[PDB]
Amino acid sequence: HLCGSHLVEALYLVCGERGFFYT
Amino acid sequence: QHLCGSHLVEALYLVCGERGFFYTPKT
Amino acid sequence: NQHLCGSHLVEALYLVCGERGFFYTPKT
Amino acid sequence: HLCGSHLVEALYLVCGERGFFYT
Amino acid sequence: GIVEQCCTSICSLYQLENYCN
Amino acid sequence: GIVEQCCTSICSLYQLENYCN
Amino acid sequence: GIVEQCCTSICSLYQLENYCN
Amino acid sequence: GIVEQCCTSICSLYQLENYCN
Amino acid sequence: HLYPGEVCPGMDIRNNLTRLHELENCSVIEGHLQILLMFKTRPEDFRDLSFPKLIMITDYLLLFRVYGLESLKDLFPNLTVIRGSRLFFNYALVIFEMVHLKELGLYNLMNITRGSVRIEKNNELCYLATIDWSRILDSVEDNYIVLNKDDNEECGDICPGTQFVERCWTHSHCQKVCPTICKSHGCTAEGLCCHSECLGNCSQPDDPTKCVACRNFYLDGRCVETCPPPYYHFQDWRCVNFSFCQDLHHKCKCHQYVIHNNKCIPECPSGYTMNSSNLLCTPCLGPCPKVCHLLEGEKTIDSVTSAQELRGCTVINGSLIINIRGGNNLAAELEANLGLIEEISGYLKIRRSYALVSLSFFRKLRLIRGETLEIGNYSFYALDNQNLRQLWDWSKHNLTITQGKLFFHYNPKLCLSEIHKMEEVSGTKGRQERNDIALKTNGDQASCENELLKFSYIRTSFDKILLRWEPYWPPDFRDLLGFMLFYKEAPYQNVVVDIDPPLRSNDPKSQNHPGWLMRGLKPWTQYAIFVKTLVTFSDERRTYGAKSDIIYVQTDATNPSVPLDPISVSNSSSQIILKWKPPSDPNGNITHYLVFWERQAEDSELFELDYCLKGLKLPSREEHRPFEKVVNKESLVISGLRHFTGYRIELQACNQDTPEERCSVAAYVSARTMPEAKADDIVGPVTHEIFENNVVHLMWQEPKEPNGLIVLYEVSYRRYGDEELHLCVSRKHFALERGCRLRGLSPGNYSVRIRATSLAGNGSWTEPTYFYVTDYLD
Amino acid sequence: VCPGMDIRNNLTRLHELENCSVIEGHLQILLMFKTRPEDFRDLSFPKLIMITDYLLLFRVYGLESLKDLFPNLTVIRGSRLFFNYALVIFEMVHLKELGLYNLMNITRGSVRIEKNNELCYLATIDWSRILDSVEDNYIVLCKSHGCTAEGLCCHSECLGNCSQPDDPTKCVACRNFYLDGRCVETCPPPYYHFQDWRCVNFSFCQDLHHKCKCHQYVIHNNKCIPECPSGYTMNSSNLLCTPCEKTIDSVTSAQELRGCTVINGSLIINIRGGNNLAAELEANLGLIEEISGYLKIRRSYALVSLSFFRKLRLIRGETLEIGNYSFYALDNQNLRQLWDWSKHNLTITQGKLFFHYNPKLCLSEIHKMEEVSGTKGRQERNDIALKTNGDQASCENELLKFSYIRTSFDKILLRWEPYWPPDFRDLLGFMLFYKEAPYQNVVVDIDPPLRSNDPKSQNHPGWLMRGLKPWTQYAIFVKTLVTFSDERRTYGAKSDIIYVQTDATNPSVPLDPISVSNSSSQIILKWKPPSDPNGNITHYLVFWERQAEDSELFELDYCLKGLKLPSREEHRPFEKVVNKESLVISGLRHFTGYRIELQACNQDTPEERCSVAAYVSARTMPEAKADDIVGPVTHEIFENNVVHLMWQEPKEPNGLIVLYEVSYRRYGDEELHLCVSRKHFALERGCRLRGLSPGNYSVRIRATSLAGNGSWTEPTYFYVTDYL
Amino acid sequence: KELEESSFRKTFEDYLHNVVFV
Amino acid sequence: FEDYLHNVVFV
């Protein structure tokens, strides 16, 4: 249950590079 | 899309075969 | 219930026989 | 829930005359 | 007779016309 | 039979008229 | 293109044979 | 979305790879 | 002036500042801005990075985990107004977890028209107390400035002028406070109020062409109060003509733009339909119109949820595919989603669609354009649609099919008559060629009864209905296999027995009317009933046979059932609320509930038992009777009743009162009223009669009206000197001794109180009765 | 010999017991509210000697004693019992005494006497003379052969009394059996043990069997029995038990016919749906073999075949359906099959075949039934409808054949032969059918391919499936989709039900890895198989790794209040847990968090195809004396009495040591306090106190760890200079 | 034990009327 | 808020 600001680094560890787009 | 496209080349390898296929995956 | 069952059987046989009429024995 | 001898007198009330046969 | 035909089983008029004259 | 109908459960006369003739 | 045909919707081989030569 | 998947419930990477590109 | 740069849309610049360079010539963000999750940006990336051209943002700003970013005074020094046209949960500004962000520095921030400011978890963020948000926000109440460097007090928030506080944004930029007459229009450098359509700042005071930004609206280098015609209020900050909105609508040929309320709007407001000439949102002609442009111009309908997406559709720019094969609420949810549709650009597919029977629940569906054709140039498809008996009521539903043909195959319950009806109504009649329509797989198992069967006589009993009807005969009457009467229960009119053929044999005057009696029926119940012929498919042009009409026959207002649950509660010594339910087979409009009641007297053996004996274990409880026809009421309180007397009550229900009362069978119940209190309390005097031998005879009047009856009497005698000794008086003991009789007791004064004991309980002690027998010495 | 009788409410029917000497049965005179003792004064039947089953009396009014009605009744056999009573006398109003002085022996049963409000002389009766077991009696609310008048014992086949002693022809009754005026011990042949009291020949049993042509009598075990015992079939010649219409609309309608074999009648079938169809129906009804009458199947909806009539090999057709049919089929919609006519053979003796409006049964089954039934030349015009029956089954006379099969794990490419009708316009499609089938106890439409040519054209239509659970057997078959011809219709083909398994592929996450550290070195990791096990999972690939303690914990001053402490390629130590879904792991440090990875392999030797990872993380238990302090407590007291303390640390702790605690108290003072952190211990090399009070102190030292407290050291004794 | 005997007599009178009344 | 924060960011 990854919550709060811990999810941000849980995401950016999964993201790493470019991450998330807007098309 | 990543799983979805991953078979498409397995599909298009069977669909085209000796013809071959051009495959752009990005976005 | 044979009584209820036979209750219409006279109404049946009066409609069935009409002017012919019907001999009807219900009991046993 | 007519039970015991209460159902017996309930039967002879409902039957009255001849009541129940054996054929 | 009629109870074995029209009561235990089901009659038509034709099974009841036997119970006419 | 009648105990399973009129004693364990509840009968009317109609469930008892089955126990008539 | 192919994602709008074979991924969002469902292709046959015939919709994929367009993505052959 | 991701909070309903990864925060209220538990995600894998595979549920988080949906939140990649 | 007012806006030298371009107008740029809303943007979300992500993970790198290369896309921030697309804000080069931008003076208005027509939208919002969200620069977020830039873990890789450094303050070197922000030293050579600035866009002072930006003057106004329409919606909001959001910042989230942009590293390296330290102040916004460099990136956007001349940003003045966020309109708050869209809000981010009532925030026109969310600054959240901005690492490295030390100050806002936005010294040209003057007025937020709509929304609030969320500042949270910005660990370095100072100069938050130096900003007068009340100058900037018309309502600072919904703001959220918490968890910053400003809260846990370490911020050296020094304004350039090194509770009432001076106002700044940096160490080098104050907060420009204009006079109060410069309300939201702001002031120039000397403090002169700007134009009343400026908002916050102006290059020259009192000039709508020398505003920096507009208070309400903008048109042609000038802050306008409104968009005058022909200019439409475009995005609530500017004024554009028809051709702009028109050509963007044509570029979206995306929010194809329409027009209403002097505004180039994306979509028409409620009840309104665009007028394709001039984009005008004109009122529709109830439900609202809904053009459902489909994905790939087609959609398979296989389930109710597949229709819930198309719920409310009217015109379909595409085709549809139908293979619903079963489920609850079929054709009803499907009408509620789908009868609303009127027009279809493409074709229509129905394949393998099993459990439904008709398409009449497409109530408004009056156009197939067939623009998308099924292969073979069909605008219509029907395959393997098994239980389908009907396309539409072609007497009711009219339908246009513009292009294409009709695919009618393997749909074995839809007759050809519906097909030729559809040919005529559809206008597609001369289109269909060989094997567009299968003749031998469609309606071939529906039997298409072109004639009617007619009932010759109906007799109903209460559970039984004699039907008589005309014997049908095919011209080759061998083929008559049977007659197939169908029925069910129907209290509305919102709508099986096989019978053999009768005896052909003759026709001078032959009642070979086959007749039918039904049997097990709930009486007084409407029954939708219809017969069908059963015949043989001919080897020739088949005789289609007949079927009777759905007739709605009610069984007979007959003796109804037992009126259920007769609950008899004796709520007084004369009141008993008998309440009950209707009969399970009410079997007619129950006129009255025929309540009979009867008083049951007390038992005879109770009058002749010696209740002075231990073993006195007492239970503490034609002819016309008093009756009641409880008309239209299923309860009854009964008055005029004795106190403490068991009664027998009979309930019937009548649905028939005046001609020869057909009433229910009896519902018996039995109950006893409450006692009275002073029924058992003893009336009349306590008489002592003392003999010469002091055989003392007691007398008393009895409780004449008791609570039912009196079982025994109790007498309390005690001397000054003795204690209460005891002796009992029963019914016969009282009746024989005419009271009581004591024999020979002790000198010194006794006293007597007397109790009645009844079936209900005890009737109170009499008064203490004083007497002395002869002492014979004194 | 008179049967068992129940004489009810009046004594007129009691006069039918006039000439009766044996009640072959029981007697029950009951509920005679209208009988009076005047009715019983002129009422007697002394001829009755024996009753075989029992007696029952209930509310016969007026009846006062039984000494008049039956003075010479002697034996109730108890052949049938009334709840182990051969005698129930219940609520006999007016009955004052029994008076049955000739009652001598009850062979079987007991005596129930209850609520007989006037009944006396109940203690005067020795029931132990009469009953061999008087224990089950209910009286509340010359061994058995008996004797004559002088007391001489009767014959040993007499029972209770005899007119002349020691004579089986001068018995009053028989002990066991009776034959021809004589009490016999057994029924000798040819006499059969008739009703367990007498001996009758074949012709008696025979002719009563023919009168019941009722319990048509049969023969077994030297007995004229009504019905044969278990496993036995009567032999119609000699009755010898030799070893072996009705509408059916529902399962319960078959539960009555459960177990039937030969049906003397006809059957009517309109079952239209329900659970366990054809299976309960076989279990009730496959057992049937023979039918005298016809067979009706009308409107019978949801079933598809009659193969579940496994033994049904005879229709006599003795009852004919009208039109002289022994068979009927109407409106039987989903029926595709009569029987496997290669398997089920069936005789239809009389009658014809009514085949109408049954649109899924092909004519081929019909002509099979014509041939097998022997009714082929019987059926005339319109006995069988041609155009309403099997007309919607398409009767694919040919087979479709698969030309290539490729399986991926979720995906199966099929290739198969393109079918073409001779008018290939009519090919409407191809109709592949499939489902899941782990047994072999057993839908997609595909368009036609491109005809266009045939030099060597792969116009093999091909098909890939997609969403599949990998490693799963799939019963799959294609059908052609064509048009019904206006001519003799081309019946088309359909492929065989092929049972293709998807691929032993990477299986799913092995479910619920529960890691319980049941020791300081043992952790039972247990788990479930993956939800998609996707193959015979060879081993469960367990990876584990020790996670060291966090670095910031070594450099925090835990003497500060705020010391809120949590009381908790490269090859790793791994395990291929073959055929086991649990694992305890040994050789582990005490009190150290570990990271564990679980995979499942259904493939180990060629190029291990294993599952995706299942991670779990856990810490072992602490040791007890890991935290307890080793080494001596050294005091070093300076000249200025700046006392430096030294001690060896707990070298192997439960993980690490966060702080140290020292207890010092004078004889005179109390324990004062001062803390020693990690860096305070590492820098001061122990502790250092500065300048305290005279009088003797004592020092015990505790370790405090992540796991808890490591016990106090020993009290350490020293004195600083008092200087006076 | 006395309620095993109670139910016993009662089994009967259960079985009493089930065999009598048709 | 922070529930609604990441639901709008991550696609």
Residue numbers in the entry:
A (entry chain P), D (entry chain R): 5 to 27
B (entry chain T): 4 to 30
C (entry chain V): 3 to 30
E (entry chain U), F (entry chain Q), G (entry chain S), H (entry chain O): 1 to 21
I (entry chain B): 1 to 162, 177 to 267, 274 to 515, 531 to 656, 754 to 910
J (entry chain A): 7 to 147, 196 to 267, 274 to 304, 318 to 515, 531 to 656, 754 to 909
K (entry chain N): 694 to 715
L (entry chain M): 705 to 715
From the paper:
Insulin plays a fundamental role in metabolic homeostasis and its dysregulation underlies many metabolic disorders, including diabetes mellitus (DM) and cardiometabolic complications. In the current studies, a novel class of insulin dimers is described that function as insulin receptor partial agonists (IRPA). To explore a structural basis by which the binding of IRPA to the IR might elucidate partial agonism and biased signaling pharmacology, single particle cryo-EM studies were conducted in the presence of RHI or IRPA to examine the structure of IR-extracellular domain (IR-ECD). The partial agonism of IRPA derives from differences from insulin in IRPA binding to the insulin receptor, differences in receptor mediated ligand endocytosis, and selectivity or bias in downstream signal transduction.
